[PDB]
Design a protein around this ligand. Structure first.
Ligand SMILES: O=C(O)Cc1ccccc1Nc1c(Cl)cccc1Cl
Ligand SMILES: O=C(O)Cc1ccccc1Nc1c(Cl)cccc1Cl
Ligand SMILES: [Ca+2]
Ligand SMILES: [Ca+2]
Ligand SMILES: [Ca+2]
Ligand SMILES: [Ca+2]
Lengths: 260, 260
């Protein structure tokens, strides 16, 4: 029923707002000067000014890649806490909850990252910096490309003009993907996802009534996100196998690993 | 200088207040009826009422032990975030930061747990429940004793009448313990700890002027906390080796382990 499907959407939106302080709405207000201004990092010189202006220094490409990777592991906390807020999720087998999050989190980071991006760059530091796409592309191989697949995805994705209320539900659908390798009980995952898919269809109808077959464009984009996490995962093996000794885990992840 | 030592103490107190929402002050107000009242769990019947009144059910002793263990891994987050707030900590080698937290966190949990305890029981659920000591002792072997060393430590510890401002510093001293096995650069750990020890001595002088040699009683208690984490660690091996398949890691710890 439409009452339920809307209350669910309203519930996910509120939890999203709770879990994720920097919203697409705010990010967009910052990117367009509706708001304060972020420090622009466009060259080595401004990177150095910038990182001063908001343990170890080692060559910049590594520091940048490392920051991205830390910010991503950092983000896992807010995403995990969001996923628990999804009706029926905390009632799945724990091994399945873990698997869903294991394969989902990068897809969600890239989705939310796009809220922070425009063809020219990306907001960092809770909106306090703006790093250009060409600056990132300027980094030496293999680092000069780690962000391009994200920018390429983001520009097409952002053309859809989704707003946080649609994203709250989109992200929930991706978490609950019953085809992750290694799942124990696929059925109750697909049940929940199909309520979620129906709340999403209704959402886009009301929210994007001049955009029929928009739901199908979004379904398309979940495929586009697998391609990106696979390129990213393969790039990471290559960096691990060619660039000795960078730390890619923030403190909390290191201690949770070690207490295990 | 005394200005510095006090500003440091003031800084640690504020970070403590930030990191740790349930303070000893509040806990004590609850335990004495200064405040609302917590649900008392004193028997199986009240445990069942209680756990209703605030994925799987398996025999109660395991559910209780499991909750304690989850709450402890949960607490690691707030402690980690507290430790970063300690001047010079985030400037140590990461491997050393990790080691300090690896061996420190249980000592701190037991210290802060004592803020939640009286000879008769312990507050749980952010102060919403009160589980009796005898109820915990009633659980079948080997569970009937996992909390007694904590109660025994807590009663003696609480006799010292420390208040959150002293605890803020105490906890910082324990984190920075330069004798943890496996530390790479012990020196800069002992430097920081000795500023911390001086801020603590000054703190107790001002805060407990009728209690000379109180500092030495607290130093004594860091030894008492090693004994408890060792009994706890050995009890845990025994439970792991005798009681199949309980989950002892909350979700975030499972995903951080798996993304590693
Ligand atoms: O900095 C932030 O808060 C945004 C964010 C979130 C997830 C992943 C990366 C980033 N930012 C960011 C990026 Cl997108 C690339 C390189 C370095 C950094 Cl610090
Ligand atoms: O419940 C809480 O918030 C307090 C807390 C903190 C750390 C460790 C354990 C506990 N509580 C608690 C205890 Cl002390 C024993 C058994 C079960 C529980 Cl849920
Ligand atoms: Ca600098
Ligand atoms: Ca619209
Ligand atoms: Ca029940
Ligand atoms: Ca006093």
């Amino acid at each position: 029923e439409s009452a339920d499907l809307r209350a669910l959407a309203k519930h996910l939106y509120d939890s999203y707002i709770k879990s994720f302080p920097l919203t697409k709405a705010k990010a967009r207000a910052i990117l367009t000067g509706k708001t304060k201004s972020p420090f622009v990092i466009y060259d080595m010189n401004s990177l150095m000014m910038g990182e001063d202006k908001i343990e170890q220094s080692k060559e910049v490409a590594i520091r940048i890649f490392q920051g991205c990777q830390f910010r991503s592991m950092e983000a896992v906390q807010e995403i995990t806490e969001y996923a628990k807020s999804i009706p029926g999720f905390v009632n799945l087998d724990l091994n399945d909850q873990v698997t869903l999050l294991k394969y989902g989190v990068h897809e969600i980071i890239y989705t939310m990252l796009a809220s922070l991006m425009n063809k020219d760059g990306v907001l960092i530091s809770e909106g306090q910096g703006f790093m250009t796409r060409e600056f990132l592309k300027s980094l030496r191989k293999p680092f000069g490309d780690f962000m391009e697949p994200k920018f390429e995805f983001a520009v097409k994705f952002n053309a859809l003009e989704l707003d946080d209320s649609d994203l709250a539900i989109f992200i929930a659908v991706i978490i609950l993907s019953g085809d992750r390798p290694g799942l124990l009980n696929v059925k109750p995952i697909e049940d929940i996802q199909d309520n979620l898919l129906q709340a999403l269809e209704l959402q886009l109808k009301l929210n994007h009534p001049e955009s029929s077959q928009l739901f199908a464009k979004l379904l398309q984009k979940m495929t586009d996100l697998r391609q990106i996490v696979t390129e990213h995962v393969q790039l990471l093996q290559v960096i691990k196998k060619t660039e000795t000794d960078m730390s890619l885990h923030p403190l909390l992840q290191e201690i949770y690993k070690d207490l295990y």
